[PDB]
Design a protein around this ligand. Structure first.
Ligand code: 7OA
Ligand code: Y1
Ligand code: Y1
Ligand code: Y1
Ligand code: Y1
Ligand code: Y1
Lengths: 99, 99
């Protein structure tokens, strides 16, 4: 799809089998969800934003269904106020910004 | 322009007469800069991100030159790690996301 930016750019995704909404966020390097459970091993990462840092678990090779595509990618899980789709996922679906 | 998202999407802007780089951020409602000074009255806001909140000053009717356009908009000023161009500025230049 093509969207304007008058509304927050939420999309519906399926991440590790769970249905979530998340913001298509060109300012986010990484993709981050709250309140999902993913199987297997993970690594700690502390990660930073405008208000400070967020502690997360980093999972590799997580299936994400987004915008008609299925991709496998890294997902961070931790208590973000808003779930975000970052550039690491958006590059996999060829997303572009016109301005 | 049209850009992919392999690179962080920085653009060069002139905001209140000062040259800055800022991330074109579809996850940001508002436009925020650190280390600029703007004239006149402002109102306190506190604003939220990942990891917490940022204290800012809100200025209205600020000049922003961006992507060959000159727009007037609201600018928040405070100690963000990265300057961001939010949807409040990007809508004024007709920006779209293609995914
Ligand atoms: C600030 C940016 C530079 C980074 N972020 C993305 C922004 O788009 C956020 C998205 C968001 C929107 C929200 F609504 C609430 C939120 F909690 C978060 N926007 C924002 O904070 O917006 C604010 C301000 C702008 O105006 C208004 O709009 C909403 C509010 C409000 C005030 S991030 O989330 O911190 C982030 C994401 C992934 C990531 N991956 C990483 N990689 C690892 C180190 C290797 S570091 C890293 C950092
Ligand atoms: Y590693
Ligand atoms: Y990893
Ligand atoms: Y990694
Ligand atoms: Y205002
Ligand atoms: Y500042």
């Amino acid at each position: 799809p093509q969207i304007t930016l008058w509304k927050r750019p939420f999309v519906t995704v399926k991440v590790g089998g769970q249905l979530k909404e998340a913001l298509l966020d060109t300012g986010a390097d990484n993709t981050i969800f709250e309140d999902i459970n993913l199987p297997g091993r993970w690594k700690p990462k502390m990660v930073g934003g405008i208000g400070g840092f967020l502690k997360v678990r980093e999972y590799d090779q997580v299936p994400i269904e987004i915008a008609g595509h299925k991709v496998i990618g890294t997902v961070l899980v931790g208590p973000t106020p808003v779930n975000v789709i970052g550039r690491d996922t958006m590059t996999q679906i060829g997303a572009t910004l016109n301005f």
